[model samples]
Target: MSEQYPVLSGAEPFYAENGPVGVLLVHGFTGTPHSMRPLAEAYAKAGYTVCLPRLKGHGTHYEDMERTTFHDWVASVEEGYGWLKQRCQTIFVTGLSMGGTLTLYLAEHHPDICGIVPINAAVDIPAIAAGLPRYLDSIGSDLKNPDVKELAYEKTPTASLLQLARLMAQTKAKLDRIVCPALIFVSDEDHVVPPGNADIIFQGISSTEKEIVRLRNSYHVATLDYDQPMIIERSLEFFAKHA
Candidate 1:
């Protein structure tokens, strides 16, 4: 076997079972489980089972991430969901950034998913995606809170971005198949993902019970930024009502 890069200290996968309701939290592209920890912990404290899985090629060196594809990340989410399936009767899925994209993908494939919550989900990247360099600049650390930082790769691999573009296209095409209720969050000033992507997603999905909220004070990493408390509260309420 080949040598693996050392995982960051606080970037490992997180799992906690509190009750019969299960919640799967997915982190964004090149992000570790730390990005989803705050929300996952909140759900667990609310008496729900929760799992936050570190996507493949994440929580390690950029070199390692270059070799991982979007399907590998999807597999990680699937594995986490499988773990929760064995323990909880009802399951809800949510994610941030690319993870949010995967949340919709999962909801489309799995009809039994109770609901979906996507924060700053990406349905499409800008035209820049078509002309990306071999290794583009970092899209990480776009947080409103100056003190909080994400444990993600500082440099973005163009190969990984190409995979994401494909994933977004695939997810976008199947958005009409997502019949479960959806709660979406979009930041007003996200430096990475365009806020219009939220509108594209909200309008594309076939779900009858979908709601979108604009974050007044946050950036791409809203899960760790100033508006985190409100997100946690709203998410729990939504889950309670839907689950």
Candidate 2:
């Protein structure tokens, strides 16, 4: 399976040195580090050490994702966080889509995280619960901008989706454990993950300093959409304010 789908060239993991501050960037399900590369680069240029990790079962083929679970994704984030911790004193985490879900999961487990930024995070999926098949047609690119491209699988594995739902349930149950400041970005026109998920997350978490920013020009893959610059700007501002 791995041979059938070698990791995309730009999907390879990346780490860039900047200064003492570190930012761990996570990519979504079936997505490669390529999706978050721009953001990572911006953060690194801003003088923050950046680490964008390719999640397990991702950056490869859909078949490989079928064999992975939510725990595997979390472990990848954990390893990335630990790696950053070794190099920097203050650490912040952020993710896009399912990466957002894992960001929340990480915040729940690691209270030491200074802050978290979740873009179009998924907390619940009513669509999957309404009879999803073993392997559904891929949610290839949900970006509103047709010119933008996302590096992700063309087919979404139901097994991985089920694991995602389970991860969501577990994360939601422990949202209060994440007391660190949170900066959440929600896309109003997201077709992949519901927009209301941001509300659920904001209302569920115990963080009093959390703020939700609504994106009007983007879809699910906002990182590469029209609001990409805004996402980067606001994220830097939030991290600076929180740090």
Candidate 3:
């Protein structure tokens, strides 16, 4: 697929070096690093190092994604956390959609982490997709803005969806293991991930300090939506409060 379709411009993995505080931002299942690039820049501007690693089988083509599994995606975030652990004093994990799901997965495995922020994460199979076909419509570019677009695959493979379901179930089962401070976000009208996913994560996690913020003007990809500024400001404050 890389030969047939060049990776989208600005869709490459992102990294910025700043203070001892580091953030690992994860993009959605079909999304590239571009979706979370703006948020990463915010963290960098606030004097923190940030890493936006591209998940395996993504940022190239849907066919590439079809060739990968949930474990590969998990390994990608695992690698990102390991990299941050070597270079930063404290680390925070945040992700959009499946990225957020992966964030929870990472938080459950790491006890040294600071805080986790998962935006519009998926905790179960979407009701609409209870019967997935070989291919599902695009789960990307879910923004309310009329003129904006998110860098994501146009179609999702059913194989990938199955992988996602497994990942969600595994992470959901281990939510109680994540004791890190948690800040979750749910958009009022997400066209993809259900708003109730935030509730499940909120209820499942054993974090003593946790809060769920609902977005009024964003779709699934809140990182690139109208409420982007608020997400950046408040999420930064969340990071600082935990730091």
- The regions of model 2 sitting more than 4 angstroms off are 1-5
Question: Tens-digit lDDT track for model 2 on 97-126?
Answer: 889999999999888899999999988989
* TM-score of structure candidate 2: 0.96
Q: What TM-score, over all chains together, does every model reach? A: 0.96, 0.96, 0.95
What digit string (tens of lDDT, one per residue) describes model 1 on residues 8-111?
89899999968999999999987889999999898988899999998888898778888888888899999998999999899999999999999999998999
All candidates: CA RMSD (Å): 1.4, 1.6, 1.9
In candidate 3, clashing pairs total 0
Residue 4, candidate 3: how far off, in angstroms?
Answer: 8.6
| Backbone clashes in model 3, listed as residue pairs | none
